[PDB]
Symmetry: D2
Amino acid sequence: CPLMVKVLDAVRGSPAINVAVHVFRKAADDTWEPFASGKTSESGELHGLTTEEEFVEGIYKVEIDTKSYWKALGISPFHEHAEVVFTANDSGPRRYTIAALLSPYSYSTTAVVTNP
Amino acid sequence: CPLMVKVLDAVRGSPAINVAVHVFRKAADDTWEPFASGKTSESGELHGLTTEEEFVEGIYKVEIDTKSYWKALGISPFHEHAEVVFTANDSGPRRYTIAALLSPYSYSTTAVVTNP
Amino acid sequence: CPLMVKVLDAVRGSPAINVAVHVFRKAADDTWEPFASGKTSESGELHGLTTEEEFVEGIYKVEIDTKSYWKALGISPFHEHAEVVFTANDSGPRRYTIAALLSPYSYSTTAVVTNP
Amino acid sequence: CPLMVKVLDAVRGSPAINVAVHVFRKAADDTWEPFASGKTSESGELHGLTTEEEFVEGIYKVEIDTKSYWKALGISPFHEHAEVVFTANDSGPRRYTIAALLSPYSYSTTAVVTNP
Ligand SMILES: O=C(O)C(F)(F)C(F)(F)C(F)(F)C(F)(F)C(F)(F)C(F)(F)C(F)(F)F
Ligand SMILES: O=C(O)C(F)(F)C(F)(F)C(F)(F)C(F)(F)C(F)(F)C(F)(F)C(F)(F)F
Ligand code: NA
Ligand code: NA
C-alpha cells in the first residue's frame, strides 16, 4: 500500500476505531487540494487511500480527526486534529505508514518509509 | 503569559534552539490569519507571544518549522513542519504551554493547561 | 500471539531491526525470573516469545535493549534500555502488543491489549 | 541541581502532582541501591534529589510510581511503574532533566542534558 494510516488510543490500550482521516496535497497555487479520505477500521488501520499512479510527488497533509474521535466517546479533548505534513516520493515511489497515538491532551506521530 | 511554546530535541537530548514558530488564529472565512511568531531561545522556549487581552477564545494553529531546524544541524527530516491546532476555551485553566519533542521521523506534542 | 513486541526507529523512519528483547516475570520471592527472550525481525517485530499455557498471570518486565541497538549503529545513546512493567492476564488471558519508538535521547511505549 | 525529574499527565493536560519517584544507583554486585526519592510538586517537578558531590558517574534508575498516580485519580492503568535507566557520564553536559509524559496505556520519556 503506498499510504497507510494507523491510529492507537493511549487511554484504552486499543486501536482507535472509526477515526476520520483526510489527506490533502499542495497544489501549484499553494492551496491544499483534497486528495483522499477514509475511516480507520476495527484494527485502527486505514488502507486504500490511494494508488501508486495517483500518489505522485508532492507535499501532503494527513489530517487525523482526533477531536471528532474523542467527542464520539464522550470526551472533550484539547486538539482539533493531528496533522502530519511531509514531502512524498521526491526520490521515486516509497511506501508510507503514518502512525499516531492519541491521548486527550497529547499525540505522538511517526512515519515508516520503505522502498519497494 | 497565556501562551508558551517549548521545543526539545530527542536526537541531541537538548532544547531545540532557534526554531521558528508561527501562531495563527482561524478567521471567520476559515482562513488562517497570522497572530504571533518568534524563535525559541537557548532553553527551547518561546515566551511573549501574546497577552491576555489579545488571546481570546477561538481556534489557533501553532506551526513549528522543524524542517529548517533539522537542516541547520545537517540532519535529513521527514516533516515539513509540526502543527498543533487547538481551541482556546475560557472555561479551562488560563495558561497554555504547548510542548513538542522532535525526532527526524517523529514528533510528540502535549498541552499543559494550568491556573496561577 | 499472546505477547508481541514491535520496535520502530524515529531517526531512520524504519523498523528497528535486530533489537534484543528480554522478558522477566516476578517470582514469589520478588526477584525477576528470566521468562523469554528474542530479537526483532526485519519488520521490527518479535513473535513467538511465549505460549498461552506458559503466559500465566503475573507481573512481567519487557526489557528492550536500546543501548545495544544504537551502539551497533555507531551511536552513543542516553538510556541503557527501555522497560515496560505490567501485570498480565489478571482477568484471564489477553493478547498484548508492546510497541516502542526509539530516539537516541528518548523513547515512547504503548500497549495494545485485546481479548481473544 | 544535577538531576531533576518532571512528570506530565496527557489525560488531564496538567502536571502530574504528588507522584512518587525513586532513584537507584547500580551497585558493584549489579543490585539497585536506593539513592534518592521524593514526590513531584504542584508543577510536576522534583528538585533537590542529589548534589554534584553525590551524583558520580554510574548507572541510575528512576522509577516513577504511575500506577498509584492513576489509581488516586480513579483511572485504570496498564503499567506498574515507569522506569528510566541511564548512565551518568562526566563528559556530557552537567545537568540532567528526566521528563515523562503519562497516559494510562502509554508513556514517553526524554532526557535534556545541558550545561550552565
Ligand atoms: O521540559 C518541560 O517543561 C516539558 F514541557 F515538560 C517537556 F519536558 F518538554 C515535556 F513536555 F515533558 C516533553 F518532554 F516535551 C514531553 F515529555 F511531554 C514530550 F516529549 F512527551 C512531549 F513531546 F509530549 F512534549
Ligand atoms: O502497531 C503498530 O504497528 C503501530 F501502531 F504502528 C505502532 F508501531 F505501534 C506505532 F503506532 F507506531 C507505535 F509505535 F505504537 C506508536 F505510534 F505508538 C509509537 F511508536 F509512537 C510508540 F512509541 F508509542 F510506540
Ligand atoms: Na526528485
Ligand atoms: Na484475577
